[PDB]
Amino acid sequence: AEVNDPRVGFVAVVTFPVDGPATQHKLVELATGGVQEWIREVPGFLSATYHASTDGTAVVNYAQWESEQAYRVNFGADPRSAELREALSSLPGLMGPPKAVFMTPRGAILPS
Amino acid sequence: AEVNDPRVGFVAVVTFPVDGPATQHKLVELATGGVQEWIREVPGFLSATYHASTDGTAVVNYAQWESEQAYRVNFGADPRSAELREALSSLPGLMGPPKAVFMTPRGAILPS
Numbered sequence A, B: 001a002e003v004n005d006p007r008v009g010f011v012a013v014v015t016f017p018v019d020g021p022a023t024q025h026k027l028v029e030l031a032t033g034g035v036q037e038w039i040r041e042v043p044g045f046l047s048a049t050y051h052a053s054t055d056g057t058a059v060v061n062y063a064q065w066e067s068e069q070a071y072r073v074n075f076g077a078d079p080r081s082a083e084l085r086e087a088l089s090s091l092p093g094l095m096g097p098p099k100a101v102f103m104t105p106r107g108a109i110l111p112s
């Protein structure tokens, strides 16, 4: 969705500390892999965008949700998200556990 | 821009440490208050979205740029960015200097 789409009521920014670019690409490919296709139909899910920090030390997901309940229950209570957590957590190269910051969009500066 | 738009070549995630929600609100009102009206027309700028963290301790900007060069030239080497930063670090309740993470979008999951 557009960064300022008014449907976005809740964002999760999740950072995975990784040992380098190879693991960045390996973490990227695994979490956008095709097997994770059920997230696409999760109700209230708006988007998950994965990024590679420029210094090769991290993968950051900026995820857009309709609400905190959508993220917490619709996605989170589903057994497959537990499956997903372990998977990304067992990846060689991860240098620690992901760190998540939860937030609400409050204002946007866009071009006219 | 859409979060998954292929014109997004560079992202800056800027986290500002604040003393609570009333300062979260004042910093967002400050950042979308006319102080950076100039940024909107700059070549390469795609968006700056300011969010309040749910725990009350931070304001996070997810900023989209067409490329790093556009960011370095059009924003980093414009003296108005130092002016922006002086205005943002003049706010009471701002607990420390902003922390920035540079990165590139790699993969994305959009809704079904």
Ligand SMILES: C[C@@H]1O[C@H]2CC(=O)O[C@@H]2C2=C1C(=O)c1c(O)cccc1C2=O
Residues within 6 Å of the ligand: B012, B014, B047, B048, B061, B063, B064, B075, B084, B085, B086, B088, B089, B098, B100
């Ligand atoms: C990286 C950067 O550093 C910050 C320090 C500050 O005080 O305001 C900053 C700041 C930074 C930035 O990248 C940035 C951007 O891409 C788009 C919009 C606004 C900012 C911004 O306000």
